């Protein structure tokens, strides 16, 4: 949720359009978004099209225009010279697809390959006029949409919902990484910042639920503290637990402690469950679900929530606001838990 | 005071003070903060979801014994309906399901005399995997249908020489409730489901009587105070269409803002008498005063 929040582009705000005033010509997906803003991920409600997410490989140049990397082909030879282009440069040239038959020497197997022309038109061009190629598939999709396996077999309407619902999952007490993923989990977990990464290589000295002590190769020792049962902005848990032993040797950049929704450094938002695809007595009727009682007995889907309450003492003109056990009109049975000072 | 509909252990108390020269907003002498923690399990009505937009609340939670179980006695953990898959065009989940099983049991492609054709382009180190293996299919470059079919055709037995899921990906289940086997094979696998933050414990609310607003004497709103469910303008047309006049009158007079009707109806109910007749809502008198405050001489004749 946080990682996706930081990579968000909102068209509405001070100096921008309004949610109840924008037409359907600004909510559409322009053919110049390829590689610069994900076409799937977007709100489902009345904000649809006004809020989007930056793509994985995109960057912003000094003038504020988003760029994408393209691998330039010279005389039909697919080089490794990555050049960052903006919308206009991409418009001038002809760009091929990443998933094309490269023949181990940077040469397409067949001459006819799908390309994108000036106005975003798609055509078949002989493999001699191509100027550039995408650095990879998975270039047009964002971080959230890059974690849906078998995305090309899902319709856009359902992929949008699946991407928007991965950032509502609650962290569970015990986490489990998926059996079938997409390899984006590790990078997203590490760049989200919810794990502890060994800043410098060394050997572990002490490990406990509260801290980790690392003895660097040159004298210095560093102690990492852990966030235990800390509340987040939305009232969930923010546990951290070490995943290293007292003798293991760590290396710079290595994950040294898990986070809320990570399993050994990889994002783990849910659990792997054994599922059948049958209709059963009408209890799973019209989008409902049936669960086993095991998932309750074994605390498979149990979670921890934390609530915060505040109160303060203020002077006031009359003066002297006090926090004390002496409360008028209150009996003693209702003052049993309160300690000596409130 | 801990507000309505909350509980749990007190895990943390953070108390500030002006005595210890702590930095507080001007005019504040002390600041106390209390944390209350709850451990919630999954229950009927909690919202679940997969990675392919297949959401849905939990309809039922069956005991372990009366659930469809495989030939070796393993109950299934979740049951999903067939009619939602083909219509919404998210067949991807099924593929995941299939691959999940191949990741769970593990497989071994038999390259005894040449690798099979379908595994010609399958990267080596995938020709055999141990049980509970973890694999990855990048978003737009992954496992083909031919490769999934091949992997399903070759998969390891569980403990004895039994293969529970056939080449089609479907297994024979037993009806855990009546005991008879189901007539046809069913599609079983492993799917990665998440728990969304739309729990019932925050949604349920009820009220008989409670706080009332100040300017207009209608009940408050929201679970934190108590509040009543709005009976809007669109719900009044349905009652008029039904022809139910008395229900609408009681809803709009002695349940919302008839200041004396409320107490009289409560007394009549507790004493077993007949419910009295409604009076005049207070918001109408508020409206008359607001109109008079605009220099409009609104008067009610007879």
């Amino acid at each position: 949720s946080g990682l996706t929040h930081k990579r968000r582009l909102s068209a509405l705000g001070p100096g921008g359009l309004s949610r109840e005033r924008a037409g359907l010509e600004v909510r559409d997906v322009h053919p110049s978004h390829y590689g610069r803003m994900c076409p799937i991920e977007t709100p489902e409600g009345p904000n649809i099209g006004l809020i989007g997410s930056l793509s994985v490989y995109a960057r912003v140049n000094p003038f504020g225009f988003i760029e994408t990397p393209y691998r330039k082909v010279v005389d039909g030879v697919v080089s490794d010279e990555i050049v960052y282009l903006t919308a206009d440069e991409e418009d001038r040239h002809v760009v091929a697809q990443a998933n094309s038959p490269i023949d181990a020497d940077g040469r397409f197997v067949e001459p006819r390959v799908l390309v994108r022309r000036k106005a975003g038109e798609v055509e078949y061009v002989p493999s001699s006029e191509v100027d550039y190629m995408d650095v990879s598939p998975r270039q047009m999709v964002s971080v959230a949409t890059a974690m849906i396996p078998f995305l090309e077999h899902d319709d856009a309407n359902r992929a949008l919902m699946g991407a928007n619902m991965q950032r509502q999952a609650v962290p569970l007490v015990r986490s489990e990484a998926p059996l079938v993923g997409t390899g984006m989990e590790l990078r997203a977990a590490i760049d989200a910042g919810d794990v502890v990464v060994a800043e410098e290589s060394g050997v572990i000295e002490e490990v406990s639920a509260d801290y980790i002590t690392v003895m660097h190769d040159n004298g210095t020792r560093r102690t990492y503290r852990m966030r235990k049962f800390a509340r987040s902005n939305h009232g969930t848990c923010a546990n951290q637990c070490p995943i290293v032993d007292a003798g293991d040797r760590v290396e710079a950049g290595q994950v040294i402690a898990d986070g809320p929704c990570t399993d050994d450094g990889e994002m783990a938002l849910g659990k792997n469950l054994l599922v059948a695809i049958m209709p059963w007595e009408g209890h799973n009727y019209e989008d409902a679900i049936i669960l086993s009682n095991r998932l309750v007995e074994e605390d498979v889907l149990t979670s921890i929530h934390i609530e915060e309450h505040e109160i303060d003492a203020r002077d006031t003109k009359l003066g002297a606001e006090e926090i004390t056990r002496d409360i008028p009109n209150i009996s003693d049975e209702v003052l049993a838990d309160l300690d000596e000072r409130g | 005071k801990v507000p309505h509909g909350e509980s749990g252990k007190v895990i943390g108390i953070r108390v500030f003070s002006r005595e210890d020269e702590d930095e507080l907003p001007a005019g504040v002498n002390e600041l106390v903060r209390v944390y209350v923690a709850q451990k919630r399990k999954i229950s009927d009505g909690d919202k679940l979801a997969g990675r392919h937009g297949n959401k849905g609340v939990i309809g039922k939670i069956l005991p372990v014994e009366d659930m469809p179980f495989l030939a070796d006695g393993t109950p299934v953990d979740i049951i999903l309906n067939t009619h939602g898959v083909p219509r919404r065009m998210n067949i991807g989940q099924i593929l995941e399901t299939h691959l999940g099983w191949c990741a769970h049991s593990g497989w071994k492609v038999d390259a005894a005399k040449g690798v099979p054709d379908w595994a010609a382009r399958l990267p080596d180190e995938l020709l055999e995997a141990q049980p509970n293996a973890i694999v990855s299919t990048p978003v737009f470059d992954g496992a083909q249908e031919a490769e999934l079919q091949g992997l399903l055709s070759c998969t390891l037995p569980n403990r004895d020489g039994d293969v529970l899921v056939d080449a089609d990906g479907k297994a024979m289940l037993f009806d855990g409730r009546s005991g008879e086997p189901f007539p046809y094979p069913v599609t079983v696998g492993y799917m990665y489901i998440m728990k969304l933050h739309h729990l019932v414990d925050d949604k349920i609310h009820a009220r008989s009587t409670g706080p009332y607003s100040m300017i207009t004497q209608q009940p408050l709103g929201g679970k934190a105070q108590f509040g009543g469910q709005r009976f809007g303008e669109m719900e009044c047309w349905a009652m008029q269409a039904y022809g139910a006049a008395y229900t609408l009158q009681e809803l709009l007079t002695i349940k919302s803002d008839d200041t004396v009707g409320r107490v009289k109806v409560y007394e009549a109910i507790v004493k077993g008498e007949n419910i009295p007749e409604p009076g005049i809502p207070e918001s109408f008198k508020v409206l008359l005063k607001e109109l008079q405050s605009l220099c409009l001489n609104v008067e009610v004749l007879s």
Binding site: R7, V56, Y57, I82, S136, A177, G183 | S136
Partner: peptide, 26 residues
Amino acid sequence: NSVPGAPNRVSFAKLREPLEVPGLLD
């Protein structure tokens, strides 16, 4: 693949990626 300590998660990918994903918070 580049992180020092990471789980071994085998991939079905066929193509090779010339460019590694940048810093997601850059």
